[PDB]
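Changelog-linked ticket: sodium ion example.
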Amino acid sequence: EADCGLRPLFEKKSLEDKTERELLESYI
Amino acid sequence: IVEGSDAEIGMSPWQVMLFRKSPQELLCGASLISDRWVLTAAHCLLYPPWDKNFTENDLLVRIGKHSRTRYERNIEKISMLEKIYIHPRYNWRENLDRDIALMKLKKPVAFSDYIHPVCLPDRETAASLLQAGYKGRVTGWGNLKETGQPSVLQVVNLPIVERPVCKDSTRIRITDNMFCAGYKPDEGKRGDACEGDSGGPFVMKSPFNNRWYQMGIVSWGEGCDRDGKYGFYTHVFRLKKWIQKVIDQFG
DNA sequence: GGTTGGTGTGGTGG
DNA sequence: TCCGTGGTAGGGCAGGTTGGGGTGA
Ligand SMILES: *C[C@@](*)(O)[C@H](CCCNC(N)=[NH2+])NC(=O)[C@@H]1CCCN1C(=O)[C@H](N)Cc1ccccc1
Ligand code: NA
Ligand code: NA
Ligand code: NA
């Protein structure tokens, strides 16, 4: 549970995948 | 996955492939939740209407993969299963209620760029994210149309759907242990899971802490990506206590 | 090479 | 207020790895 949810190749580099924003913009 | 796209490398590092030792065939998806535990759909293992009943020695799991078929040397990890736990209330006849299983690996797996566990939702996460309109993300190597398969892992992002819509969409009895997700006919955009994507994770990214949480397991559907039809997923937060107990009891 | 090596076209594609 | 007594299914009326609580219908 400690390290969970944090992708080495995305969150741990501060890089977004092309379409995660699509999800985040969907929240309302 | 129908009308999805190829996944970026490391994009879904918790994706797991449920495989059958002999004949060597890919059965389902699954997901990495700890270094020793994988969560899949029960019907991947047990489905009596087709006399499916897989033992621990029938199966393997492949973690960190991207190619469906090709051995990803120094990238993927193949593990043997210690024990399978199916939900005691799993209903294989009526509606795949509580379509969930946990599989203990014989030995713990090393995380990496391509292998990394997803978080399970707390109450707050779940309250916050399980709302109609919010999009999550489904991944798998299942079929691209409904009657071929993908070269590499597929991803699609799809919105959670209001319960009355899900209820009206199918003849099948729906439990509060399941949700549905997919675009409506008037939303323009398309997409769905299909056969072979079962046990794969429906996931959502928390705006509160940037972590990805597994809100669903690919359970079932009627066709694949048909207008008026939606993919049905096991409501994971509702069964989280069982998940906890089993882990804590048999880790 | 790649998401990863090299008596390098298979062991797993090209 | 209902959401166990068989059901997916044993033995038993409580709880287990399971009858909790949730956009709950
Ligand atoms: C086992 C999984 O690969 C698979 C997921 C299918 C998802 N389809 C879409 N469009 N998202 N599940 C199934 O194939 C399940 C298991 C057995 C039958 N089944 C179905 O989806 C039926 N078409 C519907 C169904 C039949 C019986 C009970 C519940 C649902
Ligand atoms: Na659809
Ligand atoms: Na090679
Ligand atoms: Na019981």
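Closing comment: Example verified and attached. Chain B has two domains: 1-12+118-237, 13-117+238-251. Residues B 182-183, 192, 225, 229-230 surround sodium ion (ligand 2) (CB under 6 Å).
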